[PDB]
Design brief:
part of a larger assembly; ATP-dependent Clp protease proteolytic subunit; EC 3.4.21.92; 10 chains; AAA+; Hsp100; seven-stranded mixed sheet; chaperone
């Protein structure tokens, strides 16, 4: 009973679904915790599934995540951009790092954060040990990602690239009103 | 059988439900143990689920918790202030730290506490290792959270901000009657 | 197969149930092992559930427990006092520490234990590391709890407070007949 | 697949039951491995359940156990004496220590032991760390328990108390025929 | 509830399938995380299952994988070539090492990567401790595998063998458009 | 030099002794850290050595010790009470448990304590695991030791035995002035 | 060797003393690292040794220490007040906590810190696990120590007691010039 | 020979010293490995010892160190400025962080660096866990240290303060010729 | 007795030394194990010591080493080039990485290698974890070291720079005759 | 007293040496335990030392060793062939692997083995983890060593090379008489 069951009436009413499944039916997906490969493969399966169910309706993605693996986050990032319905991203708790990256990637005009949430952005982390030759290859690889991460942030936020580049050198924390002013999100949901 | 099943008669009367699901059906949610992200996400899912089922009825949140991660707790904090129905919080066992924070956040007039329960409040904890430049950023980040947390306590309790500021400097323990006098809760439930 | 299934024929069928759920239907709740938050949280859910099923019938709480967390135990303690039906507590095996505390808290005249059980009572344990100022705060709080527990023992047993004060300074073991004389229980069950 | 399912025809259909439940249905309870609180708690639940189904029919307890916690074992011991139907105990494999204790506690004339099973008896073990004053308290309690166990052995076996006192000083192993002569069991089952 | 359930209507409408099974039904298989034997064993089973279901309907293989065991991966590789329907491989997130190897092994004209995927290729890793005679055996064994992998990459990508050998000497990262030019994939998916 | 060397002029002046040996010549012995067997064996050796050098001259024992094992402590205790010259004990830092006991054991009129030094007394600790029979034996011995330790405290401090028994029930801390009026020491040293 | 030997000319010149012993010969006692019992024994032994060599001449104590055990530090604290020679104290690197306490305890007018030395002061830390009765005792003792420590710094620094209590509430860092104004030290050494 | 013995001729020639001690006589001190309290205390002792031997003659400090504790390095830093003879620092191997700071602290005109030696500079590292109030205290202190450290390098290198701040935000590696141009060192030693 | 003592006669004949010190007298330095900071610091001290003893006479360095940390080895490297007397390096056992580098750094014409000794050369290893900006700084530095190391071997071996870069790409093993042809050493020693 | 001292007379006779140093004086070197680099260098130092003492007189190497690192052992192998005096080798206990290799390397006619000793010969062990390309390099590297070791034993034993290769594929154990016939040693020592 870690995850409670809920009952929903239909016709017969013979429906019992874990609360997570019940909300998926309402087109709500939760992205929480570290972004990794197995988790960011379920978010994708759910988005593809909802797109097919009704291509014309919004998908609500709740984000509460400290960050994670860029690669894993990119499969989510690309799926959101690829599919037809708008994905509306809602920040609760925190959206940090890769989490912030996905938050701003939601549909324009539909990106929003609950008022006491926190969004944090910062250049990607990584590392590599080996021969100087391999170090160069891997260093080049992370810088290309950093550059790519910066272009996409500028695209989605409206900040110039030069500005977005400066602002991510060191962890930058933004309060919900700051995320709005900056352009990571469009608004703050306050009351329903 | 860690969690027993209960049987409820309806029209057909065939449904059995983990006792926790049986209580979710009555709009009762239990918050126990440490506040973390996965737990909080589940509580938020339950609140969104109940809001959808019937926006006009109160949700009862039973709290028995030592505290936890602020960020995670804030996702509960904001959901409670977002969803349409009032959330009535009840403190049993303990409501410490973030647990107390959420307890006072319940709907005004509906914040209750059982008579032998304890409520404890205290400024946020945290920490960080890194370069002096990063230390400053993170230190600034925790102080803003503290300040924001102080503002919300004053809002929900009716205490002046200066008074909240002083009272959370060090752990402060309040007995149920003290929680009432202080304004963390509205009243004590005693006997049915 | 850790918990065997049982079946019962009622109206139209068998309804198998984990033996633990079969007994919940008879208004029997077991409290065993350490008293902690998750366990306690579940017992409270069971008591609230039974209270609703039939507010006019007794709930039997079987106790076989070495003790546990006071806070968690108080959650149970207050629910038993709050809910309308009497809770009849039965001690089997042992009721030590917080377990003994809950045993005596049952409805008067309905508190009983099996002949070879043991009941053990003692003042609360705890501790703290930190600055002398915090030590002072935490020490003061545990003493308030000790005082609070001492009053509740005296209330439920009929002993004077000073007598409880003396008796719990060091672990005190009571055989079932001594628990009866002391006033922790009303009687000893022997044979049906 | 650790535990197989078995299918038995009843009346209007047939039912698939975990083999362990299939045997509970025949009033057979298996006590194996160490005696502890959770397992003991489950055996007690099973005995109460069987007592209610048919108070006039014997319950068979199969014992194959190295021993365990006395307190937990006493809750089993007391339930066996309390409930109306005879509890017939059968020793297979081994009944050592507390297991032996429960074996002899079965209904007189119905305590059986398989031919190659071994029964072992010995005074209780325990220990304690602390101040000399606390040591003194705990030492007395274990001695009272020892005395109490000695009294019950003598009662159930027919041995004088002095003889039990001597025979449990150190581990004493008995072969099935020795258990019969000693009075731990009434007879040996051989072939059907 | 780690993996949500989805409900689909049919005739009667009684279909509740784990979301990954719901996708298997649409001819979609997900390869994520490390390539190992149990994973590979399951993918092969799924492909054979789909091949039989309808031998003339593409199978979509979603790849998000850092690499893994070559031996295990070759069972996927061989099954994909053996079975009649085309397997269309889609790279999301990443396809590194063995993952890249399988990505390029999809049906010609049907291999593609989402815009931000990374594909990484590199010669086989391995090792072995033992006597110089055994080292010699195992070293030859890994070199043959390297040679074999090099031939298959050249076959599928259209690169000459000499070129493909030079390019895998050290880890080589390719961006989605680079993978297209190189020939690891045929195209990039963009938007619905 | 973990331990510095010092030099002194005698006849020819070729005397270079570890500072600890230099002080041994002044009939100064340090007892610090916990009292176990090896440190006790060395103090005893030093005392026997000094007694032989000049039976008519006092030995100074500096105590700074949190405790000990008693048995080791008794070899020191008995040596001090055997050797002819007075052993004058000085408490610096702390004398607790075994340290306090030996401090009071110094020659009457010569037990000194530095002014910010702290002295602590408490009944002996111990413990034992085994059969109830052995538990009794070991409990019996610790109690005899406690009693023996209580008699010696009363003998050396001038307190009645009953008063000593009450005061060692729980850790009792004494400031240097308290030790003086209590009788653990005769006086406080101030300045040369 | 890890500590250099130095040669000094005297009469014959046949003196090769470890450099730390060479400095002890100049009445320099180097105190460093954390203060504990064993390191206190050496500081004290050295202090007694130098006092004997020339009761009229100053002893220089170099302090570079993060803190330590209050008790051990007090044996040093008292030795310095008892012995006749003034003890001059020099803070280099840092004097924190117990280290700061000892720094200020040097002879008035002879307490000083090198220019970039840091001094830190704060109320004592400690803790205790046990029964509420014992917790109270131990809490009572740490508070007495705190009070005693507050009085001694007020004595040595010239600050009012009320001011010391306010300042040591939380860690207070002082730059070397701040230590001078505060009164922890008398001056800053600059150049020879 | 962890450290070989060397022989010098003098008067009699009866001098044998661990090479480390031999070089100390030539006024050569080595600083290697990380800077900590014990190694700092030993260097300071050597500097004080050499200053006394001949206040007018230079001391050579060989640095090969990756960094270390600032506080400890400051004990060295201040001794070098306090004592009368110039301390000439020579960088070999590497000098980084605290090592780099100290080599620049050598006497002007005497700061040398071997040609393949590397020098690295960066802002101070640190961290802290605790209450937001304490985090604030500690964060301010590290920033003060950073500020103080930047002033001292600007003083010793001749760079403006703003330039030093710009250059230490992130690690800066300097080759020996770069250290000379920057001003960390005066010149490069080449060949005898 | 890990290291034997040997004796030798000079004047009175009273000379006994650790065999390792006996060898410094013959101007033999033994550099073994991995080159780290402490062993490098000691070799440098020995070279400086021998240079002072007789600036005109050769120093023999026996190399038997699997590698090192480079920085430490560069301090050895620079000392060898700085001091006036030729350093003749002899390779026995192995000279890998830093060992090989130092082997080529010996005085031209005096670099010898025993016939069954092996020499191994490779590009430097290293690595970093952290932000992409820091990865870039550290990657840039290891490549500069690689480049610097390549230049120095070309200088000492006579190989073109382009050839050194090709050869050190991957571990290159050379037998003693190969080292001679390549130019790492000048000749192979055979028999006295 | 791990290693005893022995006394010997000369002229003055004031000579006391660690028994192992006493044995170098008789030109005896022991080689025991695993061959690694630190002991190998110590053996080499001893051999060079004895060669210098008397180039015309034999050195006795006692071998009792399970084997070791080939590289380290080859530095002994070469020193033995390089230095002028014959090195006689005696096998006691065992000479396995590298130990056997060195045993046979002794001067012809002077390779002796005690009668109950065992000699074991076998091909080199080793291994490597990495890219197939590096595996190939390291595999070739070990085979060259295998070939090289095989040639040297054929040289020293008189066996054909083909025979040595066959006999070292698997561990080959020889008794002392077998070692003599095989040619690993020249003879067996029996009694003085």
């Amino acid at each position: 009973a870690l995850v409670p069951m809920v009952i929903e009436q239909t016709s017969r009413g013979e429906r019992s679904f874990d609360i997570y499944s019940r909300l998926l039916k309402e087109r709500v997906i939760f992205l929480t915790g570290q972004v990794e490969d197995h988790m960011a493969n379920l978010i994708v399966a759910q988005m593809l599934f909802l797109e097919a169910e009704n291509p014309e309706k919004d998908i609500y993605l709740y984000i509460n995540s400290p960050g994670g693996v860029i690669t894993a986050g990119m499969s989510i990032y690309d799926t959101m951009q690829f599919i037809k319905p708008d994905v509306s991203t809602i920040c609760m708790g925190q959206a940090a790092s890769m989490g912030a990256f996905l938050l701003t990637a939601g549909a324009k005009g539909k990106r929003f954060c609950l008022p006491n949430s926190r969004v944090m952005i910062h250049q990607p982390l990584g590392g590599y040990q080996g021969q100087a030759t391999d170090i160069e290859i891997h260093a080049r690889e992370i810088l290309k990602v950093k550059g790519r991460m910066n272009e996409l942030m500028a695209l989605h936020t409206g900040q110039s690239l030069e500005q977005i580049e400066r602002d991510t050198e060191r962890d930058r924390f933004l309060s919900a009103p700051e995320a709005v002013e900056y352009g990571l999100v469009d608004s703050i949901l306050t009351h329903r």
